[PDB]
Amino acid sequence: AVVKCKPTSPGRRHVVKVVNPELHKGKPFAPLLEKNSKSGGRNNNGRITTRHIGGGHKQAYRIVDFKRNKDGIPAVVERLEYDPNRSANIALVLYKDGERRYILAPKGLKAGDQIQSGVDAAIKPGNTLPMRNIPVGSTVHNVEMKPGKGGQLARSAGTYVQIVARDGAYVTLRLRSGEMRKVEADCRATLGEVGNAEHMLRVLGKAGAARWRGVRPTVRGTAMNPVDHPHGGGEGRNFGKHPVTPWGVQTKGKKTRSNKRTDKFIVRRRS
Amino acid sequence: IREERLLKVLRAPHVSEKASTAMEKSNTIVLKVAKDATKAEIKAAVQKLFEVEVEVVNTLVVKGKVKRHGQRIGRRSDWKKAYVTLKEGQNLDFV
Amino acid sequence: MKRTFQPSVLKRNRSHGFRARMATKNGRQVLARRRAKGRARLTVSK
RNA sequence: UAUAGCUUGACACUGAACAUUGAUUGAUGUUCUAACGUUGACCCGUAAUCCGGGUUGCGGACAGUGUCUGGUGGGUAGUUUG
RNA sequence: UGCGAAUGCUGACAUAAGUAACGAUAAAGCGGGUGAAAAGCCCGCUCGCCGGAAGACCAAGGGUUCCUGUCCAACGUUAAUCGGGGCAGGGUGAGUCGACCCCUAAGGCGAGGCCGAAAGGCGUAGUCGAUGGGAAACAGGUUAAUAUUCCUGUACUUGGUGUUACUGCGAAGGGGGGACGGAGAAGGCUAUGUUGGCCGGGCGACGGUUGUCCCGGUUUAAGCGUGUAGGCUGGUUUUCCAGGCAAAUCCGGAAAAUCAAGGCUGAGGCGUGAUGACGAGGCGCUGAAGCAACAAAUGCCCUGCUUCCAGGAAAAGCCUCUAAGCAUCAGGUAACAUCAAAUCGUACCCCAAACCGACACAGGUGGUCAGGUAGAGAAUACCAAGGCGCUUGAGAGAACUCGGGUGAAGGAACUAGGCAAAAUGGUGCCGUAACUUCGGGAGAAGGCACGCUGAUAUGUAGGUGAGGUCCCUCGCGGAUGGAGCUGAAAUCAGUCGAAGAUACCAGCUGGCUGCAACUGUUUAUUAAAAACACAGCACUGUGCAAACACGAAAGUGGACGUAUACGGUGUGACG
Ligand SMILES: [Mg+2]
Ligand SMILES: [Mg+2]
Ligand SMILES: [Mg+2]
Ligand SMILES: [Mg+2]
Ligand SMILES: [Mg+2]
Ligand SMILES: [Mg+2]
Ligand SMILES: [Mg+2]
Ligand SMILES: [Mg+2]
Ligand SMILES: [Mg+2]
Ligand SMILES: [Mg+2]
Ligand SMILES: [Mg+2]
Ligand SMILES: [Mg+2]
Ligand SMILES: [Mg+2]
Ligand SMILES: [Mg+2]
Ligand SMILES: [Mg+2]
Ligand SMILES: [Mg+2]
Ligand SMILES: [Mg+2]
Ligand SMILES: [Mg+2]
Ligand SMILES: [Mg+2]
Ligand SMILES: [Mg+2]
Ligand SMILES: [Mg+2]
Ligand SMILES: [Mg+2]
Ligand SMILES: [Mg+2]
Ligand SMILES: [Mg+2]
Ligand SMILES: [Mg+2]
Ligand SMILES: [Mg+2]
Ligand SMILES: [Mg+2]
Ligand SMILES: [Mg+2]
Ligand SMILES: [Mg+2]
Ligand SMILES: [Mg+2]
Ligand SMILES: [Mg+2]
Ligand SMILES: [Mg+2]
Ligand SMILES: [Mg+2]
Ligand SMILES: [Mg+2]
Ligand SMILES: [Mg+2]
Ligand SMILES: [Mg+2]
Ligand SMILES: [Mg+2]
Ligand SMILES: [Mg+2]
Ligand SMILES: [Mg+2]
Ligand SMILES: [Mg+2]
Ligand SMILES: [Mg+2]
Ligand SMILES: [Mg+2]
Ligand SMILES: [Mg+2]
Ligand SMILES: [Mg+2]
Ligand SMILES: [Mg+2]
Ligand SMILES: [Mg+2]
Ligand SMILES: [Mg+2]
Ligand SMILES: [Mg+2]
Ligand SMILES: [Mg+2]
Ligand SMILES: [Mg+2]
Ligand SMILES: [Mg+2]
Ligand SMILES: [Mg+2]
Ligand SMILES: [Mg+2]
Ligand SMILES: [Mg+2]
Ligand SMILES: [Mg+2]
Ligand SMILES: [Mg+2]
Ligand SMILES: [Mg+2]
Ligand SMILES: [Mg+2]
Ligand SMILES: [Mg+2]
Ligand SMILES: [Mg+2]
Ligand SMILES: [Mg+2]
Ligand SMILES: [Mg+2]
Ligand SMILES: [Mg+2]
Ligand SMILES: [Mg+2]
Ligand SMILES: [Mg+2]
Ligand SMILES: [Mg+2]
Ligand SMILES: [Mg+2]
Ligand SMILES: [Mg+2]
Ligand SMILES: [Mg+2]
Ligand SMILES: [Mg+2]
Ligand SMILES: [Mg+2]
Ligand SMILES: [Mg+2]
Ligand SMILES: [Mg+2]
Ligand SMILES: [Mg+2]
Ligand SMILES: [Mg+2]
Ligand SMILES: [Mg+2]
Ligand SMILES: [Mg+2]
Ligand SMILES: [Mg+2]
Ligand SMILES: [Mg+2]
Ligand SMILES: [Mg+2]
Ligand SMILES: [Mg+2]
Ligand SMILES: [Mg+2]
Ligand SMILES: [Mg+2]
Ligand SMILES: [Mg+2]
Ligand SMILES: [Mg+2]
Ligand SMILES: [Mg+2]
Ligand SMILES: [Mg+2]
Ligand SMILES: [Mg+2]
Ligand SMILES: [Mg+2]
Ligand SMILES: [Mg+2]
Ligand SMILES: [Mg+2]
Ligand SMILES: [Mg+2]
Ligand SMILES: [Mg+2]
Ligand SMILES: [Mg+2]
Ligand SMILES: [Mg+2]
Ligand SMILES: [Mg+2]
Ligand SMILES: [Mg+2]
Ligand SMILES: [Mg+2]
């Protein structure tokens, strides 16, 4: 649910958090977590390849099942849990043979629900099956791009894709960014949408809230010196130049996509 | 242990006030041994040469002090000190 | 106040030790240059 | 005045068959696999999320790389500014 | 090959000049000893300082500075008989402490491999890598210097081998455990302290002090046994499915039979340890008391419980299940007996004269212990244990400088400016405006009482809580019961001083207004701000082999993320 804090202190005034009472409390499933060490925006060389990363709370990695290859085996939702790695919540499901796994909790799926995945599965939220068997116009999520690679599209909270057409071996999808993309019909997907759609209504309220998530302060290039940023410094507040990234490339409207390998799979660009 | 090895582990009996006090109160003799001599071979060499029944052996490595002989400064070599504890019914043989 | 030299033997040996010099090629060249000059102490190893 | 990067075309890796078409030779488009890609699946080395080989699938003469080349290029460099 | 210059280079020597200074204003005085010589050394009595330290002990760092004897050449900001100085000798004792060793984090290296003019870069399998996880000891005594190491007593852990009685053992594999966040709080405790009792000694240089008086002590560990406050968790049985790559008797799922319990963990308490040790004192010998109540930790139960979002290591040790293989064999189990536990460090300084600062330097330096009286308090004041008087002193008592105290009348008239000073300052109760984002403003502003004595009440409200009585397997049990101890606050009456928040400690307040919403960051060493950041907003690029960034490339971050995400840019809460 959505709730606004009380303006007791200056930090809690604009805080707007989302508390889900149906989420499990306590330690997650033991034989599904992995060690996840923070990087800080630094590659193998040690340099900062991505700025504004570093710090934040410690997080254990929850192994989430994106392929859903366990076909022809019914599974029951045991409980919805919290995942710090992604913006969507996860659900611990139990299989008929006694196997537990993590899956992206779709919108509406509660504990005790029956989910199945396969060519012979049924059309209901949470069930996985090849997109060639999914009716056109339906809303799916966790869609694959290759037949057997795992879910990559529509994985964030509240995201989903619609099957707009199916012609032969390819299925045209409308992505959450407004793109129409051709995908092989043999690729799989999951019916419904991703839960936690109220995730976007949250407000941090203070810089400390952002510092907990591993986000460092962003210094405006205009406030730097000429040797630091192309926007450089000056006597007072002077810009006098076209906005560009801190490497010389013109931002604010300049397209940066250059990929002739996947143009045949893109029907219409976003807008 | 090699008989030729036990002959070289012992260096000299350590004379001192603490050693003499331990000898007549704790029944323990203080001996200069090789720097690489272990407690087992020290006990074996003592029982073989001194003909005394050894109870337990305690050792410690003494660090060498810095001195000056004339105008040159030197560093004395290190040496291990063994506290050989003989049995209550055993006395020491000097040869 | 706090000066620039904070003596630590572990950091000293990992930075300037003999094995650290021998690990890299420039370290071996430094050791060769020191042997050529006749240095009584090649590295910081004690 | 140059140059990294980005980007355009030509030649090589780089093939086949057909239709339209500009002049025996080019361009366009549609199919195919055998070059090539695969940060899709499985098996083996192998009690290994590296790597190599095999099968299969998807792309496919595209992408990408090399030489030449037009544009852009204070991102970088050397300089001038009596 | 010729020197007077080059703020020329090197060495020696003048000048200032016998001048500044002799390094925290915590402080010294005297008697004796030694000595050539004593303010500085030792001994003795007084005085002052610290005492969440200027005490005690570790890890780093140093390496002999540790103890003893001897010397005062040089060093010590003075002298020196003294020293962290010179010289010689002595001193560091471990199955239980740490290293070492087993296992891993970040990270490093890296057989093959990929990439790259070369040198080399990345990286798989592996191997290193603590600041983390893994077996085990305590009390007293002893040296000039070591002790949890040596002695006494009393313990504990691990492994090898041999014998006896039973027995399916076996991993480079599967499962469990290891195993983990912040904040809050109270239930029981303990360390510890106060008092009472008991024991030993005293009857006070000056008015009283045989008593309700004074002084000191009144200690005892590890381990073993018992298994309590509390915490977690239903147990046993059988049939089945096969998810854990193979198997599984293990974990996972299902179904029924059953019993209202079972198991795990767990401080503290008591017995033993201990007829011992220690023990004030008395004569190397002996050595009495050695109990109770209350108060109470930030330490333990507690890796607990509650709650919250930011969702909070790994692996090994350990337990458990089997594959290959071995079936009077091996191996495992239980008992006993022996053997082994190697090597390295151990001295000393660690709020410092010994480490980092060129110094015997008013600086810095991680961790553990934490007494009494007041106090909320680890603040503060005075003290205990313990450690110190800070390595130049003696005189006088000018200007002037430094750090303070007081000050008539006035009270900011000073000055760029109330700079600095002066002033407020606590608890409890009453009371409190504009405005407001309804939370604040606010401790607004302002006011009243505060000491001691007696009574209520020979100590009340409250807390703790003994003996006895009753009940039940019979106990570290329940009810009762209230002795004893402990113990605020309030009122009334009285009383003393100029003053009772009496010392130290301890907000100055209000009004208008610019800037930035706020908490925060910033030019280490002249600028802490209106500057940066920030939550929020908008634009923009990116469909994943993403954009983008570091890399000749491989490769890596983005991200083990997927448009409710990521990057860049500008603005900067909110209306
Ligand atoms: Mg794990
Ligand atoms: Mg990462
Ligand atoms: Mg950013
Ligand atoms: Mg993450
Ligand atoms: Mg910014
Ligand atoms: Mg921002
Ligand atoms: Mg600037
Ligand atoms: Mg500037
Ligand atoms: Mg520029
Ligand atoms: Mg301007
Ligand atoms: Mg202008
Ligand atoms: Mg011993
Ligand atoms: Mg030793
Ligand atoms: Mg030598
Ligand atoms: Mg591969
Ligand atoms: Mg230029
Ligand atoms: Mg030039
Ligand atoms: Mg001359
Ligand atoms: Mg001249
Ligand atoms: Mg001059
Ligand atoms: Mg003068
Ligand atoms: Mg003068
Ligand atoms: Mg003077
Ligand atoms: Mg002085
Ligand atoms: Mg001075
Ligand atoms: Mg005399
Ligand atoms: Mg005297
Ligand atoms: Mg003095
Ligand atoms: Mg004295
Ligand atoms: Mg204090
Ligand atoms: Mg000490
Ligand atoms: Mg050391
Ligand atoms: Mg030194
Ligand atoms: Mg040492
Ligand atoms: Mg010395
Ligand atoms: Mg000394
Ligand atoms: Mg003299
Ligand atoms: Mg002198
Ligand atoms: Mg001496
Ligand atoms: Mg000395
Ligand atoms: Mg140990
Ligand atoms: Mg590693
Ligand atoms: Mg490497
Ligand atoms: Mg190699
Ligand atoms: Mg290792
Ligand atoms: Mg460690
Ligand atoms: Mg000592
Ligand atoms: Mg395991
Ligand atoms: Mg676990
Ligand atoms: Mg841990
Ligand atoms: Mg906590
Ligand atoms: Mg107690
Ligand atoms: Mg008496
Ligand atoms: Mg009298
Ligand atoms: Mg008394
Ligand atoms: Mg079961
Ligand atoms: Mg918790
Ligand atoms: Mg959350
Ligand atoms: Mg078998
Ligand atoms: Mg020691
Ligand atoms: Mg010591
Ligand atoms: Mg300290
Ligand atoms: Mg100091
Ligand atoms: Mg020093
Ligand atoms: Mg001094
Ligand atoms: Mg000092
Ligand atoms: Mg105190
Ligand atoms: Mg008190
Ligand atoms: Mg006070
Ligand atoms: Mg004091
Ligand atoms: Mg004292
Ligand atoms: Mg001291
Ligand atoms: Mg002084
Ligand atoms: Mg004066
Ligand atoms: Mg003055
Ligand atoms: Mg004054
Ligand atoms: Mg006046
Ligand atoms: Mg006056
Ligand atoms: Mg006035
Ligand atoms: Mg005024
Ligand atoms: Mg004026
Ligand atoms: Mg004036
Ligand atoms: Mg002032
Ligand atoms: Mg004042
Ligand atoms: Mg007030
Ligand atoms: Mg006010
Ligand atoms: Mg009590
Ligand atoms: Mg009066
Ligand atoms: Mg103040
Ligand atoms: Mg103005
Ligand atoms: Mg501000
Ligand atoms: Mg501030
Ligand atoms: Mg500054
Ligand atoms: Mg700034
Ligand atoms: Mg690449
Ligand atoms: Mg990558
Ligand atoms: Mg701005
Ligand atoms: Mg503004």
Author numbering:
A (entry chain C): 2 to 272
B (entry chain U): 2 to 96
C (entry chain d): 1 to 46
Copy text verbatim from the article accompanying this structure deposition.
In all living cells, ribosomes are responsible for translating the genetic information from mRNAs to proteins. Due to this central role in protein synthesis ribosomes are frequently targeted by antibiotics that specifically inhibit bacterial translation by binding to the prokaryotic 70S but not eukaryotic 80S ribosomes. Cadazolid (CDZ) belongs to a new class of antibiotics termed quinoxolidinones and is in development for the treatment of Clostridium difficile infections (CDI). The molecule combines elements of an oxazolidinone with a fluoroquinolone moiety, resulting in unique biological and physicochemical properties.
In this study, we determined the cryo-electron microscopy (cryo-EM) structure of an E. coli 70S ribosome in complex with mRNA, a P-site tRNA and CDZ, resolved at 3.0 Å. The subset containing two tRNAs in P and E-sites of the ribosome revealed the presence of the quinoxolidinone antibiotic and was refined to higher resolution by focusing refinement on the 50S subunit, resulting in reconstructions reaching overall resolutions of 3.0 Å. In the focused reconstruction we could unambiguously identify the density of the CCA-acyl end of a charged P-site tRNA and CDZ bound in the vicinity of the PTC. CDZ is bound deeply in a pocket within the PTC. Overall, the oxazolidinone moiety of CDZ binds to the same pocket and in a similar orientation as other oxazolidinone antibiotics, with the A- and B-rings forming the main interface next to the polypeptide exit tunnel at the PTC. The fluorophenyl B-ring is stacking onto residue C2452 while being sandwiched between residues U2506 and A2451. The 2-oxazolidone A-ring is bound to the PTC pocket in a similar fashion as oxazolidinones, in the close vicinity of G2061, stacking against U2504 with its hydroxymethyl tail oriented towards A2503. The fluoroquinolone moiety is oriented towards the empty A-site tRNA binding pocket of the PTC, where it could be reasonably modelled in two alternative conformations: one with the cyclopropyl group pointing towards the P-site tRNA and one pointing towards residue A2507 of the rRNA. However, in the other conformation, A2602 is “flipped-out”, thereby stacking on top of the fluoroquinolone moiety.
